[PDB]
Ligand binder design. Structure first.
Ligand SMILES: [N]
Ligand SMILES: [N]
Ligand SMILES: [N]
Ligand SMILES: [N]
Ligand SMILES: [N]
Ligand SMILES: [N]
Ligand SMILES: [N]
Ligand SMILES: [N]
Length: 457
Protein backbone atom coordinates (compact mmCIF):
# COMPACT_ATOMS: atom_id res chain seq x y z
CA UNK A 1 0.00 0.00 0.00
CA UNK A 2 1.65 3.25 -1.38
CA UNK A 3 3.32 5.26 1.51
CA UNK A 4 1.83 8.76 1.96
CA UNK A 5 4.31 11.47 0.97
CA UNK A 6 3.18 14.84 2.42
CA UNK A 7 5.04 17.00 -0.07
CA UNK A 8 3.30 15.37 -3.03
CA UNK A 9 0.76 18.09 -2.10
CA UNK A 10 3.49 20.74 -2.46
CA UNK A 11 5.76 22.61 -0.11
CA UNK A 12 4.67 23.73 3.38
CA UNK A 13 3.13 27.23 3.70
CA UNK A 14 1.62 29.39 6.49
CA UNK A 15 -2.15 29.51 5.80
CA UNK A 16 -3.96 32.87 5.20
CA UNK A 17 -5.54 33.07 8.71
CA UNK A 18 -2.07 33.00 10.34
CA UNK A 19 -2.74 29.92 12.54
CA UNK A 20 -2.07 26.68 10.59
CA UNK A 21 0.36 25.11 8.14
CA UNK A 22 -0.83 23.79 4.79
CA UNK A 23 0.69 22.37 1.62
CA UNK A 24 0.52 24.52 -1.55
CA UNK A 25 -2.50 22.65 -2.88
CA UNK A 26 -4.55 23.62 0.20
CA UNK A 27 -4.14 20.34 2.11
CA UNK A 28 -3.78 20.64 5.88
CA UNK A 29 -0.51 19.73 7.48
CA UNK A 30 -1.11 18.49 11.01
CA UNK A 31 2.37 18.42 12.52
CA UNK A 32 2.97 15.44 14.81
CA UNK A 33 6.56 15.67 15.96
CA UNK A 34 8.88 13.09 17.49
CA UNK A 35 12.06 14.06 19.32
CA UNK A 36 15.10 12.23 17.88
CA UNK A 37 17.68 14.72 19.10
CA UNK A 38 20.81 12.55 18.94
CA UNK A 39 19.79 10.64 15.80
CA UNK A 40 22.67 11.92 13.56
CA UNK A 41 25.27 11.34 16.32
CA UNK A 42 24.30 7.97 17.82
CA UNK A 43 22.41 5.76 15.32
CA UNK A 44 24.01 3.80 12.48
CA UNK A 45 22.28 3.17 9.12
CA UNK A 46 20.22 0.08 10.11
CA UNK A 47 19.20 1.65 13.42
CA UNK A 48 18.12 4.91 11.81
CA UNK A 49 15.98 3.07 9.25
CA UNK A 50 14.35 1.12 12.08
CA UNK A 51 13.72 4.28 14.14
CA UNK A 52 12.28 6.24 11.24
CA UNK A 53 9.98 3.36 10.19
CA UNK A 54 8.72 2.86 13.74
CA UNK A 55 7.92 6.58 13.94
CA UNK A 56 6.04 6.48 10.63
CA UNK A 57 3.97 3.49 11.80
CA UNK A 58 2.70 5.67 14.69
CA UNK A 59 1.72 8.74 12.66
CA UNK A 60 4.69 11.09 13.27
CA UNK A 61 5.54 13.23 10.23
CA UNK A 62 8.31 15.47 11.67
CA UNK A 63 11.46 14.10 13.39
CA UNK A 64 13.33 16.83 15.36
CA UNK A 65 17.11 16.30 15.41
CA UNK A 66 20.25 18.05 16.53
CA UNK A 67 22.17 18.28 13.26
CA UNK A 68 25.15 19.30 15.43
CA UNK A 69 25.41 18.96 19.24
CA UNK A 70 29.11 20.07 19.55
CA UNK A 71 31.77 21.75 17.45
CA UNK A 72 32.87 19.43 16.03
CA UNK A 73 30.24 16.71 16.41
CA UNK A 74 31.01 12.98 16.21
CA UNK A 75 28.86 10.20 14.84
CA UNK A 76 28.67 6.50 15.75
CA UNK A 77 31.11 5.71 12.97
CA UNK A 78 33.81 8.02 14.46
CA UNK A 79 33.45 10.78 11.83
CA UNK A 80 33.90 14.52 12.55
CA UNK A 81 31.25 16.99 11.30
CA UNK A 82 34.11 19.42 10.56
CA UNK A 83 37.54 18.42 9.17
CA UNK A 84 38.89 22.07 8.69
CA UNK A 85 36.87 24.28 11.08
CA UNK A 86 34.11 26.15 9.28
CA UNK A 87 35.74 25.63 5.86
CA UNK A 88 33.38 23.25 4.05
CA UNK A 89 34.93 23.26 0.53
CA UNK A 90 36.63 19.82 0.91
CA UNK A 91 34.12 18.31 3.37
CA UNK A 92 33.12 15.55 0.91
CA UNK A 93 35.91 13.03 0.44
CA UNK A 94 35.81 10.42 -2.37
CA UNK A 95 35.42 6.91 -0.81
CA UNK A 96 34.80 8.14 2.79
CA UNK A 97 31.30 7.82 4.28
CA UNK A 98 31.46 11.07 6.21
CA UNK A 99 29.36 12.70 8.95
CA UNK A 100 27.37 14.58 6.27
CA UNK A 101 26.96 11.57 3.97
CA UNK A 102 25.26 9.84 6.96
CA UNK A 103 23.19 13.02 7.54
CA UNK A 104 22.20 12.83 3.85
CA UNK A 105 21.21 9.15 4.33
CA UNK A 106 19.01 9.94 7.33
CA UNK A 107 17.27 12.68 5.44
CA UNK A 108 16.66 10.53 2.31
CA UNK A 109 15.56 7.44 4.30
CA UNK A 110 13.07 9.74 6.07
CA UNK A 111 11.87 11.09 2.71
CA UNK A 112 11.04 7.55 1.48
CA UNK A 113 8.83 7.12 4.59
CA UNK A 114 7.09 10.49 4.16
CA UNK A 115 8.80 12.14 7.17
CA UNK A 116 10.17 15.71 7.53
CA UNK A 117 13.49 16.27 9.39
CA UNK A 118 13.34 19.20 11.79
CA UNK A 119 16.98 20.23 11.54
CA UNK A 120 18.28 22.01 14.65
CA UNK A 121 21.29 23.42 12.77
CA UNK A 122 23.39 23.67 15.95
CA UNK A 123 22.25 23.19 19.55
CA UNK A 124 22.43 26.26 21.82
CA UNK A 125 25.24 24.99 24.13
CA UNK A 126 28.24 25.14 21.86
CA UNK A 127 27.03 28.54 20.50
CA UNK A 128 26.73 30.15 23.97
CA UNK A 129 30.17 28.67 24.81
CA UNK A 130 31.77 30.68 21.92
CA UNK A 131 32.12 27.94 19.31
CA UNK A 132 30.24 29.70 16.47
CA UNK A 133 30.83 33.39 15.87
CA UNK A 134 29.11 35.56 13.25
CA UNK A 135 31.39 34.58 10.32
CA UNK A 136 31.30 30.92 11.25
CA UNK A 137 27.46 31.13 11.34
CA UNK A 138 27.25 32.59 7.82
CA UNK A 139 29.69 29.96 6.49
CA UNK A 140 27.69 27.15 8.18
CA UNK A 141 24.24 28.41 7.06
CA UNK A 142 25.53 28.74 3.51
CA UNK A 143 26.93 25.15 3.64
CA UNK A 144 23.58 23.83 4.97
CA UNK A 145 21.43 25.67 2.48
CA UNK A 146 23.49 24.68 -0.57
CA UNK A 147 23.57 21.02 0.49
CA UNK A 148 19.89 20.65 1.50
CA UNK A 149 17.73 23.25 -0.34
CA UNK A 150 16.46 20.65 -2.87
CA UNK A 151 15.84 17.90 -0.33
CA UNK A 152 12.00 18.09 -0.09
CA UNK A 153 11.66 17.07 3.57
CA UNK A 154 13.38 19.65 5.76
CA UNK A 155 12.16 22.17 8.29
CA UNK A 156 14.92 24.48 9.70
CA UNK A 157 15.22 25.01 13.48
CA UNK A 158 17.31 28.01 14.58
CA UNK A 159 18.40 28.00 18.23
CA UNK A 160 18.13 24.93 20.45
CA UNK A 161 17.29 25.30 24.16
CA UNK A 162 18.54 28.90 24.22
CA UNK A 163 16.98 32.34 24.78
CA UNK A 164 16.67 34.61 21.70
CA UNK A 165 18.64 37.39 23.49
CA UNK A 166 21.78 35.14 23.84
CA UNK A 167 24.09 35.20 20.81
CA UNK A 168 21.38 36.99 18.83
CA UNK A 169 23.75 38.26 16.19
CA UNK A 170 24.98 34.71 15.56
CA UNK A 171 21.49 33.23 15.26
CA UNK A 172 20.31 36.06 12.86
CA UNK A 173 23.33 35.46 10.68
CA UNK A 174 22.71 31.73 10.54
CA UNK A 175 19.04 32.19 9.79
CA UNK A 176 19.51 34.95 7.14
CA UNK A 177 22.34 33.00 5.42
CA UNK A 178 20.06 29.94 5.08
CA UNK A 179 17.09 32.00 3.84
CA UNK A 180 19.18 33.87 1.22
CA UNK A 181 19.81 30.54 -0.59
CA UNK A 182 16.97 28.19 0.48
CA UNK A 183 13.49 29.42 -0.48
CA UNK A 184 11.93 25.93 -0.25
CA UNK A 185 11.66 25.27 3.49
CA UNK A 186 10.14 26.85 6.55
CA UNK A 187 12.11 28.04 9.62
CA UNK A 188 11.52 28.47 13.37
CA UNK A 189 13.58 29.11 16.53
CA UNK A 190 13.65 26.54 19.33
CA UNK A 191 13.95 28.46 22.60
CA UNK A 192 14.87 28.04 26.31
CA UNK A 193 12.70 26.19 28.75
CA UNK A 194 9.63 28.20 29.83
CA UNK A 195 10.06 30.69 26.89
CA UNK A 196 8.53 31.31 23.44
CA UNK A 197 10.31 32.40 20.24
CA UNK A 198 7.63 35.07 19.88
CA UNK A 199 9.28 37.11 22.65
CA UNK A 200 12.32 37.88 20.49
CA UNK A 201 11.47 36.86 16.88
CA UNK A 202 7.71 37.26 16.06
CA UNK A 203 8.47 40.14 13.66
CA UNK A 204 11.57 38.43 12.10
CA UNK A 205 10.95 37.82 8.37
CA UNK A 206 13.02 34.58 8.38
CA UNK A 207 10.67 33.04 11.03
CA UNK A 208 7.58 31.39 9.52
CA UNK A 209 6.08 30.15 12.77
CA UNK A 210 6.76 30.30 16.49
CA UNK A 211 7.85 27.52 18.81
CA UNK A 212 7.96 27.29 22.65
CA UNK A 213 9.35 24.85 25.23
CA UNK A 214 6.88 24.09 28.03
CA UNK A 215 8.99 21.23 29.49
CA UNK A 216 9.99 19.96 32.07
CA UNK A 217 9.03 21.46 35.52
CA UNK A 218 5.92 20.82 37.65
CA UNK A 219 3.71 23.41 39.41
CA UNK A 220 5.86 25.44 41.86
CA UNK A 221 9.21 23.92 40.92
CA UNK A 222 11.93 26.50 41.52
CA UNK A 223 15.64 25.77 42.17
CA UNK A 224 16.50 29.05 43.94
CA UNK A 225 16.09 32.66 42.78
CA UNK A 226 16.55 34.49 39.47
CA UNK A 227 14.26 36.40 37.11
CA UNK A 228 11.64 33.76 36.26
CA UNK A 229 10.14 34.05 32.71
CA UNK A 230 6.64 32.92 33.93
CA UNK A 231 4.24 33.64 36.83
CA UNK A 232 4.79 31.32 39.85
CA UNK A 233 2.68 28.08 39.81
CA UNK A 234 1.91 28.11 36.01
CA UNK A 235 4.66 25.66 34.81
CA UNK A 236 2.25 23.01 33.56
CA UNK A 237 -0.18 25.50 31.95
CA UNK A 238 1.37 25.23 28.47
CA UNK A 239 -1.82 26.85 27.02
CA UNK A 240 -0.44 30.13 28.41
CA UNK A 241 2.52 30.03 25.98
CA UNK A 242 0.07 29.61 23.15
CA UNK A 243 -2.07 32.67 24.09
CA UNK A 244 0.97 34.88 24.69
CA UNK A 245 2.60 33.93 21.37
CA UNK A 246 -0.52 34.40 19.25
CA UNK A 247 -1.45 37.75 20.92
CA UNK A 248 1.72 39.26 19.34
CA UNK A 249 0.95 40.85 15.95
CA UNK A 250 1.14 40.14 13.09
CA UNK A 251 -0.12 36.73 14.17
CA UNK A 252 1.91 33.64 13.19
CA UNK A 253 1.36 29.95 13.91
CA UNK A 254 2.76 28.38 17.13
CA UNK A 255 3.67 24.93 18.51
CA UNK A 256 5.11 23.33 21.64
CA UNK A 257 8.42 22.09 20.26
CA UNK A 258 9.42 20.51 23.58
CA UNK A 259 6.79 19.69 26.15
CA UNK A 260 7.50 17.36 29.00
CA UNK A 261 9.10 14.11 27.93
CA UNK A 262 7.67 10.69 28.75
CA UNK A 263 9.63 9.12 31.70
CA UNK A 264 11.78 12.20 32.37
CA UNK A 265 11.90 13.24 36.06
CA UNK A 266 9.97 16.39 37.18
CA UNK A 267 12.40 19.37 36.65
CA UNK A 268 15.47 17.35 35.41
CA UNK A 269 17.84 18.10 38.36
CA UNK A 270 16.91 15.04 40.57
CA UNK A 271 17.35 11.60 38.87
CA UNK A 272 14.91 10.04 41.48
CA UNK A 273 11.98 12.54 41.23
CA UNK A 274 8.51 11.59 39.95
CA UNK A 275 8.50 10.70 36.24
CA UNK A 276 6.08 12.29 33.75
CA UNK A 277 3.58 9.61 32.51
CA UNK A 278 1.35 8.95 29.48
CA UNK A 279 -1.51 10.90 31.08
CA UNK A 280 0.74 13.96 31.49
CA UNK A 281 2.03 13.68 27.93
CA UNK A 282 -1.53 13.63 26.59
CA UNK A 283 -2.54 16.60 28.80
CA UNK A 284 0.25 18.78 27.42
CA UNK A 285 -0.60 17.72 23.85
CA UNK A 286 -4.35 18.45 23.98
CA UNK A 287 -3.91 21.64 26.03
CA UNK A 288 -1.47 23.08 23.49
CA UNK A 289 -3.57 22.17 20.48
CA UNK A 290 -6.93 23.23 21.95
CA UNK A 291 -5.31 26.57 22.89
CA UNK A 292 -4.55 27.12 19.18
CA UNK A 293 -1.29 25.37 18.38
CA UNK A 294 -1.07 24.12 14.78
CA UNK A 295 0.16 20.66 15.84
CA UNK A 296 2.23 19.09 18.61
CA UNK A 297 5.72 17.59 19.15
CA UNK A 298 6.16 14.63 21.58
CA UNK A 299 9.28 13.33 23.27
CA UNK A 300 10.55 10.45 25.40
CA UNK A 301 13.55 10.58 27.76
CA UNK A 302 15.10 7.39 26.38
CA UNK A 303 14.37 7.97 22.66
CA UNK A 304 15.62 11.57 22.50
CA UNK A 305 19.10 10.53 23.69
CA UNK A 306 18.98 7.12 21.98
CA UNK A 307 19.86 5.31 25.21
CA UNK A 308 21.57 1.93 24.65
CA UNK A 309 23.01 -0.73 26.98
CA UNK A 310 26.47 0.47 28.01
CA UNK A 311 25.49 4.14 27.64
CA UNK A 312 23.76 5.55 30.70
CA UNK A 313 21.47 8.47 30.16
CA UNK A 314 21.12 11.91 31.50
CA UNK A 315 18.05 12.31 33.79
CA UNK A 316 18.23 8.73 35.09
CA UNK A 317 17.31 6.91 31.86
CA UNK A 318 18.18 3.14 31.80
CA UNK A 319 15.60 1.77 29.32
CA UNK A 320 16.90 1.50 25.71
CA UNK A 321 15.40 3.68 23.01
CA UNK A 322 14.24 0.56 21.13
CA UNK A 323 12.22 -0.65 24.14
CA UNK A 324 10.80 2.87 24.73
CA UNK A 325 9.00 2.43 21.37
CA UNK A 326 6.38 0.31 23.27
CA UNK A 327 5.71 2.95 25.95
CA UNK A 328 2.16 4.28 25.99
CA UNK A 329 2.35 8.01 25.41
CA UNK A 330 4.47 7.47 22.29
CA UNK A 331 1.71 5.19 20.98
CA UNK A 332 -1.19 7.62 21.77
CA UNK A 333 -0.16 10.75 19.86
CA UNK A 334 -1.71 9.35 16.67
CA UNK A 335 -5.17 9.69 18.23
CA UNK A 336 -4.66 13.46 18.49
CA UNK A 337 -3.64 13.78 14.80
CA UNK A 338 -6.52 11.55 13.60
CA UNK A 339 -8.91 13.73 15.67
CA UNK A 340 -7.81 17.09 14.36
CA UNK A 341 -7.81 15.87 10.72
CA UNK A 342 -11.43 14.59 11.03
CA UNK A 343 -12.89 18.19 11.13
CA UNK A 344 -12.73 21.46 9.07
CA UNK A 345 -9.15 22.51 9.60
CA UNK A 346 -8.44 26.16 8.79
CA UNK A 347 -11.46 27.80 10.48
CA UNK A 348 -10.63 26.23 13.89
CA UNK A 349 -10.06 28.77 16.69
CA UNK A 350 -9.62 28.50 20.47
CA UNK A 351 -12.71 29.60 22.44
CA UNK A 352 -13.06 29.32 26.24
CA UNK A 353 -16.54 30.96 26.01
CA UNK A 354 -17.70 27.53 24.72
CA UNK A 355 -17.45 26.53 28.41
CA UNK A 356 -20.24 28.09 30.51
CA UNK A 357 -20.69 28.45 34.26
CA UNK A 358 -17.68 28.15 36.57
CA UNK A 359 -14.51 26.46 35.19
CA UNK A 360 -11.87 24.56 37.11
CA UNK A 361 -8.32 25.59 37.90
CA UNK A 362 -5.04 23.75 37.23
CA UNK A 363 -5.80 20.22 35.91
CA UNK A 364 -9.59 20.85 36.30
CA UNK A 365 -9.54 23.69 33.69
CA UNK A 366 -11.50 22.31 30.77
CA UNK A 367 -10.36 23.63 27.40
CA UNK A 368 -12.37 24.14 24.20
CA UNK A 369 -11.88 24.80 20.51
CA UNK A 370 -14.33 25.18 17.60
CA UNK A 371 -15.04 25.74 13.95
CA UNK A 372 -18.31 27.13 12.57
CA UNK A 373 -20.18 23.83 12.77
CA UNK A 374 -18.27 21.80 15.43
CA UNK A 375 -16.79 22.18 18.88
CA UNK A 376 -14.50 20.05 21.04
CA UNK A 377 -13.93 20.13 24.80
CA UNK A 378 -10.93 18.41 26.41
CA UNK A 379 -11.62 17.42 30.02
CA UNK A 380 -8.63 15.94 31.86
CA UNK A 381 -10.06 15.21 35.36
CA UNK A 382 -13.69 14.40 34.45
CA UNK A 383 -15.04 17.34 36.51
CA UNK A 384 -18.66 18.09 35.46
CA UNK A 385 -18.89 20.78 32.78
CA UNK A 386 -21.41 23.01 31.05
CA UNK A 387 -21.03 23.44 27.29
CA UNK A 388 -22.78 26.14 25.24
CA UNK A 389 -23.94 24.64 21.93
CA UNK A 390 -25.10 28.05 20.50
CA UNK A 391 -21.48 29.04 19.71
CA UNK A 392 -21.71 26.78 16.60
CA UNK A 393 -24.29 26.44 13.81
CA UNK A 394 -27.19 23.92 13.66
CA UNK A 395 -30.54 23.89 15.47
CA UNK A 396 -29.82 20.32 16.59
CA UNK A 397 -26.31 19.06 17.60
CA UNK A 398 -24.95 15.50 17.66
CA UNK A 399 -22.51 14.68 20.56
CA UNK A 400 -19.83 11.99 21.26
CA UNK A 401 -17.19 11.10 23.84
CA UNK A 402 -13.63 10.46 22.45
CA UNK A 403 -11.23 8.79 24.88
CA UNK A 404 -7.65 9.94 24.08
CA UNK A 405 -5.64 6.93 25.31
CA UNK A 406 -7.24 4.63 22.68
CA UNK A 407 -9.20 6.75 20.13
CA UNK A 408 -12.53 5.08 21.01
CA UNK A 409 -15.78 6.90 20.22
CA UNK A 410 -19.09 6.69 22.16
CA UNK A 411 -22.21 8.27 20.73
CA UNK A 412 -24.08 10.29 23.39
CA UNK A 413 -27.21 11.51 21.47
CA UNK A 414 -29.07 14.55 20.05
CA UNK A 415 -29.39 17.91 21.83
CA UNK A 416 -31.15 21.28 21.33
CA UNK A 417 -29.13 24.54 21.16
CA UNK A 418 -28.65 25.67 24.84
CA UNK A 419 -26.09 25.20 27.59
CA UNK A 420 -25.81 21.48 28.53
CA UNK A 421 -24.27 19.64 31.50
CA UNK A 422 -21.78 16.79 30.75
CA UNK A 423 -19.94 14.30 32.93
CA UNK A 424 -18.07 11.29 31.57
CA UNK A 425 -18.61 8.01 33.43
CA UNK A 426 -14.99 7.38 34.51
CA UNK A 427 -12.79 7.85 37.56
CA UNK A 428 -12.33 11.41 38.69
CA UNK A 429 -8.79 12.79 38.32
CA UNK A 430 -7.65 9.25 37.19
CA UNK A 431 -5.89 10.13 33.93
CA UNK A 432 -8.96 9.04 31.91
CA UNK A 433 -9.02 12.19 29.84
CA UNK A 434 -11.70 12.59 27.21
CA UNK A 435 -12.86 14.94 24.48
CA UNK A 436 -16.52 15.90 24.12
CA UNK A 437 -17.16 16.11 20.36
CA UNK A 438 -20.27 18.09 19.33
CA UNK A 439 -21.25 18.58 15.65
CA UNK A 440 -24.08 20.50 13.83
CA UNK A 441 -26.67 17.69 13.06
CA UNK A 442 -26.76 18.46 9.31
CA UNK A 443 -23.00 17.58 8.96
CA UNK A 444 -21.46 14.10 8.71
CA UNK A 445 -17.81 14.50 9.84
CA UNK A 446 -18.37 11.73 12.38
CA UNK A 447 -21.02 9.02 11.82
CA UNK A 448 -23.38 7.83 14.69
CA UNK A 449 -22.38 4.14 14.04
CA UNK A 450 -18.56 4.70 14.49
CA UNK A 451 -16.73 2.86 17.31
CA UNK A 452 -13.46 4.80 16.50
CA UNK A 453 -11.91 7.60 14.35
CA UNK A 454 -9.75 6.02 11.59
CA UNK A 455 -6.28 7.11 10.42
CA UNK A 456 -5.93 10.42 8.48
CA UNK A 457 -2.31 10.59 7.17
N1 LIG B 1 -1.37 22.89 11.01
N1 LIG C 1 25.50 8.40 14.14
N1 LIG D 1 35.22 21.60 8.06
N1 LIG E 1 26.14 11.81 11.10
N1 LIG F 1 -0.93 27.98 15.62
N1 LIG G 1 11.19 18.09 21.90
N1 LIG H 1 -5.14 28.53 16.34
N1 LIG I 1 11.58 11.15 21.75
Amino acid sequence: QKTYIPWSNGKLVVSEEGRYLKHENGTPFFWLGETGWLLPERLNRDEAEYYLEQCKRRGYNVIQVQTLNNVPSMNIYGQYSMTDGYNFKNINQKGVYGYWDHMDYIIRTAAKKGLYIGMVCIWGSPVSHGEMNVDQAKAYGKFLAERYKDEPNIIWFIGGDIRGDVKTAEWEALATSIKAIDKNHLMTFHPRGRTTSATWFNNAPWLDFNMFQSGHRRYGQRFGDGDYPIEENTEEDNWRFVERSMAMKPMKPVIDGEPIYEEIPHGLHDENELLWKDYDVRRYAYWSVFAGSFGHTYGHNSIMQFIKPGVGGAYGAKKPWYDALNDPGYNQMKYLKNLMLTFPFFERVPDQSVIAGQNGERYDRAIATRGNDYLMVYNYTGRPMEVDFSKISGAKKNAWWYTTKDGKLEYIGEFDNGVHKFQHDSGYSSGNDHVLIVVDSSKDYVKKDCYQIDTHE
